From Swiss-Prot, chain A:
Attaches the virion to the cell membrane by interacting with host receptor, initiating the infection. The major receptor is host ACE2. When S2/S2' has been cleaved, binding to the receptor triggers direct fusion at the cell membrane. When S2/S2' has not been cleaved, binding to the receptor results in internalization of the virus by endocytosis using host TFRC and GRM2 and leading to fusion of the virion membrane with the host endosomal membrane. Alternatively, may use NRP1/NRP2 and integrin as entry receptors. The chain holds residues 350 to 398 of 1273 of the full protein. The gene is S. Binds to host ACE2. RBD also interacts with the N-linked glycan on 'Asn-90' of ACE2. Cleavage of S generates a polybasic C-terminal sequence on S1 that binds to host Neuropilin-1 (NRP1) and Neuropilin-2 (NRP2) receptors. Interacts with host integrin alpha-5/beta-1 (ITGA5:ITGB1) and with ACE2 in complex with integrin alpha-5/beta-1 (ITGA5:ITGB1). May interact via cytoplasmic c-terminus with M protein. May interact (via N-terminus) with host bilirubin and biliverdin, thereby preventing antibody binding to the SARS-CoV-2 spike NTD via an allosteric mechanism. The lineage of its organism: Viruses, Riboviria, Orthornavirae, Pisuviricota, Pisoniviricetes. This is Spike protein S1.
Length: 49, 50
């Protein structure tokens, strides 16, 4: 946790329906956007930690 | 300027209507003035008050 990774996501299509088998028992509680319509949106810069 | 009154009628109506249409792009203290952006940004609990 102290030396957390940082990854850059760009020039790709991001699918969220795949994030079910890879991460069972997940919890996408989050902020800044309604998760229900993340499908029809576009993001300029995505950082994964 | 002989026909000032009729032109004043036309100008009054046009400017009132234009004020009405320009006021539509006012924030009214919102985060954003587009209801769609409000709808794609917040939870319905606070989108409601917005």
């Amino acid at each position: 946790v102290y030396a957390w990774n940082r990854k850059r996501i760009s020039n790709c299509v991001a699918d969220y329906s795949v994030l079910y088998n890879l991460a069972p028992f997940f919890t996408f509680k989050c902020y800044g956007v309604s998760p229900t319509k993340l499908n029809d949106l576009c993001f300029t810069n995505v950082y994964a930690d | 300027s002989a026909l000032g009154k009729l032109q004043d009628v036309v100008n009054h109506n046009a400017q009132a209507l234009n004020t009405l249409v320009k006021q539509l792009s006012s924030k009214f203290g919102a985060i954003s003035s587009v209801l769609n952006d409000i709808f794609s940004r917040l939870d319905p609990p606070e989108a409601e008050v917005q």
